[PDB]
Amino acid sequence: ESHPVLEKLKAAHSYNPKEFEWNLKSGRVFIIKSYSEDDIHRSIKYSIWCSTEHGNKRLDSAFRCMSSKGPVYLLFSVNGSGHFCGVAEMKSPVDYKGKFDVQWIFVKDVPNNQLRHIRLENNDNKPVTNSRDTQEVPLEKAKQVLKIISSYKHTTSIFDDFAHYEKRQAVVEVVRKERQSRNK
């Protein structure tokens, strides 16, 4: 019993491509910390992201500075989750409440213990699994992370709970409309 939104997305995009070039000639790579699974679900279905106001300025500057020299990749993790949940490529500058276009590439859970040994010299040598939102990963360590994420034989992903997130979204909209209506 697959959800029609997810079947449409899977037919229109090649998630988790078996051929992905982790050994980047160029590009910049940033950590994205999401506040919830629900935000990841929206990002995948609508191909957009919003960071904080400071986070949006950092990402906007990197995208415009990259000027299509190469990609800007985003490594997603929800706060407190203990795994990374995928990778998207940033696909537009920030549009202003800033949003920007993203293209999701990997959708798969990679547990933190697979990436913990990789430390970020530009962030007091802490593990990449201990980053804040829009932490930049140096190029050579980004290749190592992308190599691990790309080849990891995942057992699950947010797609396994897709219908649950769809139902939560639809219920929340109705709850809000009714509340707004009682406020009249």
Ligand X SMILES: CCN(CC)CCNC(=O)c1ccccc1S
User: Per the annotation, where are the binding residues for RNA?
Assistant: 33-35, 39, 49-50, 79
- Which position among 10, 13, 20, 38 is part of the footprint of ligand X (CB under 6 A)? 38
- Which position among 16, 43, 51, 134 is part of the footprint of ligand X (CB under 6 A)? 43
Least Å distance between CB 118 and ligand X?
27
Least Å distance between CB 139 and ligand X?
27
Q: Which of residues 69-108 bind ligand X (CB under 6 A)?
A: 99
DSSP letters of the chain? ---HHHHHHHHHS--S-SS---S-SS-EEEEEEES-HHHHHHHHHHTEE---HHHHHHHHHHHHHHTTSS-EEEEEEETT-SEEEEEEEE-S--B---BEEEEEEEEEEEEGGGTTT-EEGGGTTEEGGGPPTTPEEPHHHHHHHHHHHHH---S--GGGGHHHHHHHHHHHHHHHHHHHHHT-
Span of 18-26, 48-56, 87-95, 156-164 interacting with ligand X by CB under 6 A = 48-56
> Residue count at the site for ligand X (CB under 6 A)?
10
The site for ligand X (CB under 6 A) is made up of 35-36, 38-39, 42-43, 48-50, 99
